[PDB]
Amino acid sequence: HGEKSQAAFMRMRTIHWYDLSWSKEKVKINETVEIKGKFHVFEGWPETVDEPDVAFLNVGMPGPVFIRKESYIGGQLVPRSVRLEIGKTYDFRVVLKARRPGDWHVHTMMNVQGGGPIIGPGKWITVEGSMSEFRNPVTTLTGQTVDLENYNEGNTYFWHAFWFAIGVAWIGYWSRRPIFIPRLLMVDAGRADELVSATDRKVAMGFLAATILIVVMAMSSANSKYPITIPLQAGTMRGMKPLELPAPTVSVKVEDATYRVPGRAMRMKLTITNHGNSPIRLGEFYTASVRFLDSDVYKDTTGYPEDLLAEDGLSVSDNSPLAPGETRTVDVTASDAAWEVYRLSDIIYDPDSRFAGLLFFFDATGNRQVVQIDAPLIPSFM
Amino acid sequence: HGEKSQAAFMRMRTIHWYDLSWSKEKVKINETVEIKGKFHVFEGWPETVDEPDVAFLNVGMPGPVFIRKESYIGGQLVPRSVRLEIGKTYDFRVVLKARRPGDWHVHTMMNVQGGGPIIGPGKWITVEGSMSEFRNPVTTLTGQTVDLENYNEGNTYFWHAFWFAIGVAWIGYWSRRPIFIPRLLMVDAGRADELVSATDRKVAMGFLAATILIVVMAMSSANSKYPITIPLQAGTMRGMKPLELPAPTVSVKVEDATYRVPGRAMRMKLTITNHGNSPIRLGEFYTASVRFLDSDVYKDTTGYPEDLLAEDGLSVSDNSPLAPGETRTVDVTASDAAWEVYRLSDIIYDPDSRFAGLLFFFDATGNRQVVQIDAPLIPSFM
Amino acid sequence: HGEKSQAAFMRMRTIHWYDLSWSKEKVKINETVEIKGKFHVFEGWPETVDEPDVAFLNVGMPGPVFIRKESYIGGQLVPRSVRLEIGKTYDFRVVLKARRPGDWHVHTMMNVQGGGPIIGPGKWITVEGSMSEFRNPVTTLTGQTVDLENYNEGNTYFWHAFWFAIGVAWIGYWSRRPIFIPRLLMVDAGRADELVSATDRKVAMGFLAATILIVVMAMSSANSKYPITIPLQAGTMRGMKPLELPAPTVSVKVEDATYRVPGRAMRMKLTITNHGNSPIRLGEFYTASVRFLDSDVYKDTTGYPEDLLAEDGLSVSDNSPLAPGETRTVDVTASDAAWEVYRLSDIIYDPDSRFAGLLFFFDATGNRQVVQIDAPLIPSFM
Ligand SMILES: CCCCCCC/C=C/CCCCCCCC(=O)OC[C@H](COP(=O)(O)OCCN)OC(=O)CCCCCCCCCCCCCCC
Ligand SMILES: CCCCCCC/C=C/CCCCCCCC(=O)OC[C@H](COP(=O)(O)OCCN)OC(=O)CCCCCCCCCCCCCCC
Ligand SMILES: CCCCCCC/C=C/CCCCCCCC(=O)OC[C@H](COP(=O)(O)OCCN)OC(=O)CCCCCCCCCCCCCCC
Ligand SMILES: CCCCCCC/C=C/CCCCCCCC(=O)OC[C@H](COP(=O)(O)OCCN)OC(=O)CCCCCCCCCCCCCCC
Ligand SMILES: CCCCCCC/C=C/CCCCCCCC(=O)OC[C@H](COP(=O)(O)OCCN)OC(=O)CCCCCCCCCCCCCCC
Ligand SMILES: CCCCCCC/C=C/CCCCCCCC(=O)OC[C@H](COP(=O)(O)OCCN)OC(=O)CCCCCCCCCCCCCCC
Ligand SMILES: CCCCCCC/C=C\CCCCCCCC(=O)OC[C@H](COP(=O)(O)OCCN)OC(=O)CCCCCCCCCCCCCCC
Ligand SMILES: CCCCCCC/C=C\CCCCCCCC(=O)OC[C@H](COP(=O)(O)OCCN)OC(=O)CCCCCCCCCCCCCCC
Ligand SMILES: CCCCCCC/C=C\CCCCCCCC(=O)OC[C@H](COP(=O)(O)OCCN)OC(=O)CCCCCCCCCCCCCCC
Ligand SMILES: [Cu+2]
Ligand SMILES: [Cu+2]
Ligand SMILES: [Cu+2]
Ligand SMILES: [Cu+2]
Ligand SMILES: [Cu+2]
Ligand SMILES: [Cu+2]
């Protein structure tokens, strides 16, 4: 939730999430779900979004209904912010543990500093069980195993209640006497010195000394109880390993790209050159989490969110085997209610009417090439 | 105009504009002139100029004597700011349309954010005709063809005059009575409440209600008249395609570079190694829009501004065919009044006495290699 | 001095200084000492240190006990700040001239803007002689040879004394009369106009006119005496040539890296793959200026500061010739008091417990390969 309201061109021109898998659709409490996939950083990064020099891989959900057990970018655990390069592709994996029952829309997201949220496709996952069964065991380097759900709760309650009680006692010591009107009149009359006695001064001295001594003793006792402590671990982790992918033996030029403004579709003229890899055929156009597929060339079998999957939303004028070398100019039409449901038609309000997306080409043997396209998008009103 | 006053080293060390062409020297009104060429970004970019992450290709002229019909960087239209990389070469093309008659010095420039203006060579172009004949037709996506010279002029005049008249009427309603002295005396005397009557309150209420209602009705009518509107299109366009140029089979090392301070020339010792490409010969040294040529090796036939063209300003101790492999140390002398006219001799006031420029080598067949040189420049006073 | 107090991980993860040489250990006054070596910029640059876009090569010493005659980065003199790229290796050379007698700990350092100091290994150098024998001759472009120790000293003294005397005379002219109490009483009584006479006004006018005229005449005389002047030369020098080094035919993966917190050592599990270059053997681990060596494989003969040299501080479970192709998992133990002396054990207070260093592999013929390792460092308390 939160993507439909984001500018259409910003969603089109930031990060592209390609083949994704979810290990389970329905999980029990304390069971783990794995979300893997690839994300590509668009070369034409918008200028109002800072470059992903400081980026964090996040899980979009209405709260800690899951707990993120681990997250890996390129096989490396990433508990901190990371640095990503423009134009590179990265594998990502996220292992989550179920905490609260219910149906949850879970998304993979990249939070970018100086940019904001970049939400990926969301999937509905059902958690069955009771929240009381959730456990979060962690073993420390000191040899102690604790449960993070209730660890250190009683100590915090005790100390906060103790200090609150001390403050309440300090206020109530003075609250046993007339408070506001008689004291104000006495101060106005010049009898302020009569409002504080020697016993009050001794009580204040005792309160101050007891507070300081208790703080010192509590710090000493806490140090004795936990002689081994480390500061909070923070920093930006550089040197993320990107994917070394086969360059596309397929070249695609966008002649024109238009959308009818009333409109639930997008149309584009494309010149495609096959540089080998056998006769190929376009099977899918990915724009903003929406996948328009050509049923005759490719069929999704990964449980891609159906609200974002158009099984026959790709209409190519001529989708015949493009013999290696053939340069065919084709008119592709990406049509689906998701265009209007995911407010991609709101590119009419955007201060930049340019789109970007991914095209997937398959040969007879099923090998897939990914081609990256970007162009300006012209609205049609006649 | 405006380059002679810019620091000599800043002009030497930012952008180099090489082979340029102008389609016409004399044009009529509404006729188009094309300026094409190449620009190279110097690797040793000055630190006080921000990197050209946000750069705009501009035309330097005393105003809209021309209108910039289009501009292309690497074959791509660039109506917005673009991103350029240090050390890369780009083709540029600019098509301008003549608007005002007269002789105009036209320059191609790169405005760089956090840096300032980078002016290129200027050429004198004559426009013959009358300004009243200039037309700027534009066809909108709604099917309307308009002339940008006078489009929406009457509407703006009408609305501004209407609101100015309303304000004048509001002031003049109160201006029919004594204004300053009697009213001031009455306010001082305590008779302020007598200065505003019930009729005045009713007039003020009517003015407020009429203003609000007129604004609302005008907005509704404007929306009805123009139901299709888009916001201003802005942004920085990345992914500019640079030139893939042959690396210079010629290696040049600058041993020493000196200039006499009184002085109208510059001298340099150079070690040149030919790595193939047949016997070569130096034909031209480009510094800051100034081209020093060796008449025996090369002759300009592009109409390069004569104030910046020194046909025999390159004197090479030995400019004989440098057999592939020969490593000759030569003393080159670049001499021309342009050195003093374009204030390149003002490098003596610069906080950085280092120069950069381009050397052009030609073989027997006429093939040209471009070598890029940079060195510190030492003034000579004895 | 000043490195032991710097965070251990910051010292481990910034710049690595490898093979270094000092021309002399004991020098006389006016004699020169050359310090050469290589420095590598770590790929995982810490986020709190700005990238070395503006870096200066500096000499760490308690003052001008030496004078830095020259400094070269990649064979190019670097009197100004320079730009360095992450992940590149550079040669550096520094020629210093002895000025003051005594024993001096001299370090090579890289000052990085927005980062702070990066100190390298320090060496003790003895200077014998008298400071009065030190000379700093410099020949100017005007044909004058001067000594920078005493040049322009007398002129500065004369002008400062002259202006101080003028100010003292101005104060003392008024100081001959009663100063504070009688004048205050007269001003309070309304007799302020009697405290300044016409002669005082004439004296003030003469002082003002003389000051302005003297300033103008002094400027004119200084211009006449030195008709050739240049501004201060400043700027950041880009285009530093890095080393083109053989990629390591040796691959090393860090399985685990741990240190006992009481502790004077560090332990690591490593998987090493030989990709040719004959049977190899680990001979040295460099962490933070500390070099742990395996005496049986390699011996230092460069006079590396002994406080930072552990001749037998590298213990490899199996350090037998790793036949090209062999993938052996070995347990290496780097032990030395320098770990505690140079406060590398203070990584326990660091907000980032990750280390980086260099491994040196030698074959039978003595050829050396450098492998770069980085991992998180886990403290052991049991
Ligand atoms: C829950 C209260 C709201 C917020 C409290 C915030 C800070 C505390 C303020 C007052 C503390 C001192 C009590 C008054 C002097 C406590 C005090 O003097 O009690 C005797 C009073 C005074 O004697 P008197 O002049 O002969 O009688 C006048 C009132 N009948 O008599 C009483 O019968 C008791 C009345 C006082 C009861 C108020 C207690 C509420 C405060 C404790 C709340 C603790 C929880 C805090 C978080 C919400
Ligand atoms: C690092 C330097 C210290 C900071 C400088 C200021 C220090 C001030 C000193 C007092 C100067 C004022 C004159 C008072 C003369 C001595 C003095 O302390 O008198 C009591 C004064 C009231 O002043 P007075 O009676 O008119 O003074 C005349 C002689 N008694 O109250 C206080 O000082 C505050 C309340 C009583 C203090 C008891 C200790 C509790 C507070 C400290 C914590 C102790 C427990 C430590 C935990 C381990
Ligand atoms: C061009 C004027 C300069 C700038 C104007 C700026 C804002 C407007 C100020 C005054 C408007 C109300 C007029 C006075 C009450 C208009 C008004 O009350 O006119 C009757 C006056 C007053 O009657 P009275 O007391 O019996 O006579 C005294 C003056 N003789 O009599 C007149 O004979 C007319 C004199 C007033 C003429 C001034 C008009 C100029 C202002 C309009 C300019 C519009 C263009 C604006 C942009 C420049
Ligand atoms: C979103 C919330 C609204 C903002 C809150 C403030 C609103 C204020 C309300 C009035 C409170 C003061 C008491 C007045 C009582 C009602 C009232 O409006 O009285 C007239 C008052 C003068 O006060 P009064 O006579 O002593 O009031 C006693 C009873 N009449 O003048 C005004 O309110 C201003 C001039 C007359 C207003 C006429 C409408 C023109 C202005 C609004 C635009 C209407 C056209 C819309 C275009 C589509
Ligand atoms: C070294 C002094 C410290 C700093 C000086 C800073 C600025 C100068 C202040 C005073 C200058 C005017 C002198 C007084 C009027 C100089 C002056 O009027 O001298 C005659 C006085 C006054 O005559 P009187 O009323 O009959 O006698 C009263 C004092 N006996 O008599 C004297 O016997 C001389 C006393 C004055 C000597 C003070 C001189 C010190 C200042 C010069 C220092 C220069 C070095 C500067 C850097 C440190
Ligand atoms: C660029 C524009 C200049 C700045 C504008 C202000 C200039 C001010 C002028 C004076 C106006 C006040 C009326 C005084 C009338 C003329 C005048 O200068 O009178 C003397 C006034 C005192 O005023 P007054 O006697 O009541 O004036 C009545 C007629 N004399 O003192 C001063 O002006 C200051 C002290 C005397 C000046 C002598 C010259 C020394 C200062 C300047 C440097 C000269 C040497 C140059 C070196 C090459
Ligand atoms: C959450 C836990 C709540 C803690 C509650 C603590 C109690 C707080 C205040 C008690 C007020 C009694 C005032 C009696 C003066 C009532 C009073 O003033 O009585 C006259 C005495 C006469 O004493 P004397 O013998 O003639 O002279 C002194 C030596 N003999 O004067 C005084 O000066 C008596 C001073 C006594 C002050 C006691 C207050 C100390 C409170 C510290 C509390 C510590 C916090 C808890 C620790 C875990
Ligand atoms: C650029 C175009 C210029 C537009 C010029 C607009 C004219 C402006 C002001 C007229 C002043 C007349 C004042 C008469 C009070 C003169 C006045 O006060 O007369 C006494 C009346 C008595 O009226 P009554 O009948 O006894 O009671 C009300 C119901 N019957 O009192 C009032 O309260 C009369 C109020 C009348 C106010 C009229 C002003 C409205 C002006 C709106 C202009 C709209 C803008 C143009 C639209 C395109
Ligand atoms: C470090 C070097 C130190 C320099 C010391 C300079 C001496 C400073 C002040 C002298 C005070 C004498 C005051 C006499 C008034 C004492 C005074 O006021 O005497 C009455 C005269 C009467 O003169 P008169 O003839 O009747 O009228 C004028 C034409 N004839 O009035 C005046 O107005 C006299 C004005 C004389 C002022 C002289 C002060 C000039 C000082 C400039 C110094 C230059 C700096 C050094 C250059 C290298
Ligand atoms: Cu959602
Ligand atoms: Cu992409
Ligand atoms: Cu010009
Ligand atoms: Cu260049
Ligand atoms: Cu030291
Ligand atoms: Cu390194």
DSSP C76-103: EE-SSEE---TT-EEEEEEEEEE-S-EE
Mode of pairing for the β-strands spanning A81-82 and A236-237: parallel
Check whether residue A202 and residue A126 sit in a common domain.
no
Rounded to a whole number of angstroms, the CA Rg of chain A reads: 31
Q: Is B229 on the interface with A (CB under 8 A)?
A: no
Regarding the beta carbon of B176 and ligand 3, being less than 6 Å apart is answered yes
Check whether residue C169 and residue C263 sit in a common domain.
no
Residue to mutate (ligand 1; options A173, A175, A179; most atoms within 8 A of CB): A175
Q: Are A103 and A126 in contact (CB under 8 A)?
A: yes
Helix (H) / strand (E) containing B15: strand B15-17
B1 is in an annotated binding site: yes
User: How far away, in angstroms, is B202 Cα from ligand 4 center?
Assistant: 12
A105 is in an annotated binding site: yes
- Which residue in A has a C-alpha nearest to residue B76's C-alpha? A375
Q: Is A194 helix (H, G, I), strand (E, B) or coil?
A: helix
A160 is in an annotated binding site: no
Q: Is B373 on the interface with A (CB under 8 A)?
A: no
Composition of chain A by helix, strand, coil, percent to 5: 20, 40, 40
> C232, C255, C285 — which closes off a domain?
C232
How far is residue C234's CA from residue A229's CA, in Å, rounded to a whole number? 48
Solved with = cryo-EM
To the nearest whole Å, the CA of B81 is away from the closest chain A CA by 10
Q: Is C263 on the interface with A (CB under 8 A)?
A: no
B352 contacts in chain C (CB < 8 Å): 233-235
Query: CB C239 to CB B43 under 8 A?
Result: yes
Buried b (16+ CB within 10 A) or exposed e, C27-62: bebeeebebbbbbbbbebbbbebebbbbbbbbbbbe
Q: Hey, what long-range contacts does B240-244 have (CB within 8 A, 24 or more apart)?
A: B240/B73, B240/B74, B240/B76, B240/B78, B240/B82, B240/B83, B240/B84, B240/B90, B241/B74, B241/B75, B241/B76, B242/B74, B242/B85, B242/B88, B242/B89, B242/B90, B243/B38, B243/B74, B243/B88, B243/B89, B243/B90, B243/B91
How far is residue A337's CA from residue A264's CA, in Å, rounded to a whole number? 6
DSSP C248: -
Check whether residue B92 and residue B239 sit in a common domain.
yes
How far is residue B114's CA from residue B81's CA, in Å, rounded to a whole number? 13
C234 contacts in chain B (CB < 8 Å): 351-352
Helix (H) / strand (E) containing B374: strand B368-376
Buried b (16+ CB within 10 A) or exposed e, B343-376: bbbebbebebbbbbbbbbbbbeeeebbbbbbbbe
Q: Is A239 on the interface with C (CB under 8 A)?
A: yes
Within a 10 A sphere around the Cβ of A259, how many other Cβ atoms?
Answer: 23
Check whether residue C3 and residue C85 sit in a common domain.
yes
Query: CB B380 to CB C141 under 8 A?
Result: yes
Cα angle at A72 between A70 and A74, to 5 degrees?
A: 170
Protein residue with its CA nearest to atom 13 in ligand 1: A172
Q: Is B163 helix (H, G, I), strand (E, B) or coil?
A: helix
User: How far away, in angstroms, is A4 Cα from ligand 10 center?
Assistant: 10
A234 contacts in chain C (CB < 8 Å): 351-352
The single-letter code of the amino acid at B99 is R
Q: Which CA distances in Å does C63 have to B200, C119, C138, C338, C373?
A: 83, 15, 21, 26, 36
Protein residue with its CA nearest to atom 5 in ligand 3: B168
Within a 10 A sphere around the Cβ of A335, how many other Cβ atoms?
Answer: 17
Check whether residue C251 and residue C373 sit in a common domain.
yes
Check whether residue C117 and residue C55 sit in a common domain.
yes
Domain count, chain B: 3
Q: Is B34 on the interface with C (CB under 8 A)?
A: no
Identify the residue among A238, A240, A241 best suited for mutation to test binding to C, counting C beta carbons within 10 A and taking the highest.
A238
Bridge partners, residue C93, by sequence? C36, C72
User: How far away, in angstroms, is B203 Cα from ligand 8 center?
Assistant: 6
Q: Are A129 and A111 in contact (CB under 8 A)?
A: no
Q: Are C315 and C333 in contact (CB under 8 A)?
A: yes
Tokens standing for residue C382: 């049991």
How far is residue B328's CA from residue B280's CA, in Å, rounded to a whole number? 12
How far is residue A144's CA from residue C314's CA, in Å, rounded to a whole number? 33
Check whether residue C274 and residue C370 sit in a common domain.
yes
Identify the residue among A76, A82, A84, A230 best suited for mutation to test binding to C, counting C beta carbons within 10 A and taking the highest.
A230
How far is residue B170's CA from residue B164's CA, in Å, rounded to a whole number? 10
How far is residue A140's CA from residue C343's CA, in Å, rounded to a whole number? 25
Check whether residue C104 and residue C34 sit in a common domain.
yes
Q: How many residues does chain B have?
A: 382
- Alpha-helical (H) ranges within chain C are 8-12, 153-175, 181-189, 198-225, 338-341
Tokens standing for residue C364: 């039978």
What is the residue range of A277's domain? Answer: 247-382
Identify the nearest ligand to the CA of A162 by its number.
Answer: 7
How far is residue B9's CA from residue C299's CA, in Å, rounded to a whole number? 51
To the nearest whole Å, the CA of C8 is away from the closest chain A CA by 14
How far is residue C46's CA from residue C29's CA, in Å, rounded to a whole number? 41
Query: Which residues lie closer than 8 Å to C19 by C-beta, 6 or more apart?
Result: C37, C38, C302
B374 contacts in chain C (CB < 8 Å): 239
Place of tokens 């004058």: C144
Check whether residue B178 and residue B285 sit in a common domain.
no
Check whether residue C71 and residue C113 sit in a common domain.
yes
Residues measured by CB to lie within 5 Å of ligand 11, the ion: A 16, 40, 42
Helix (H) / strand (E) containing B314: strand B314-316
C275 is in an annotated binding site: no
Mode of pairing for the β-strands spanning A250-260 and A378-380: parallel
Q: Is C141 on the interface with B (CB under 8 A)?
A: yes
- Ligand 8 pocket (Cβ < 6 Å) reads B 162, 165-166, 169, 199, 202-203, 206, 210
Q: Is A120 helix (H, G, I), strand (E, B) or coil?
A: strand
To the nearest whole Å, the CA of A373 is away from the closest chain B CA by 12
Ligand 2 atom closest to Cα of residue A213: 47
> A197, A214, A246 — which closes off a domain?
A246
Reported resolution in A? 2.4
In A23-141, DSSP assigns E strands to 26-28, 32-41, 55-60, 66-73, 76-77, 81-82, 89-98, 102-112, 116-128, 137-139
**Any idea what the CATH number is for the domain that residue C186 is in?**
1.10.287.710
How far is residue A335's CA from residue A270's CA, in Å, rounded to a whole number? 16
> B178, B212, B246 — which closes off a domain?
B246
Q: Are A273 and A250 in contact (CB under 8 A)?
A: yes
How far is residue A69's CA from residue A98's CA, in Å, rounded to a whole number? 10
How far is residue A110's CA from residue A53's CA, in Å, rounded to a whole number? 12
Q: Is A121 helix (H, G, I), strand (E, B) or coil?
A: strand
Strand order in the sheet with C368-376: C309-310, C291-293, C280-286, C354-363, C368-376
**Any idea what the CATH number is for the domain that residue B52 is in?**
2.60.120.570
Backbone angles phi, psi at A295, to 5 degrees: -45, -35
Check whether residue C293 and residue C346 sit in a common domain.
yes
Q: Are A361 and A371 in contact (CB under 8 A)?
A: yes
Check whether residue C91 and residue C141 sit in a common domain.
no
**Any idea what the CATH number is for the domain that residue A375 is in?**
2.60.40.1580
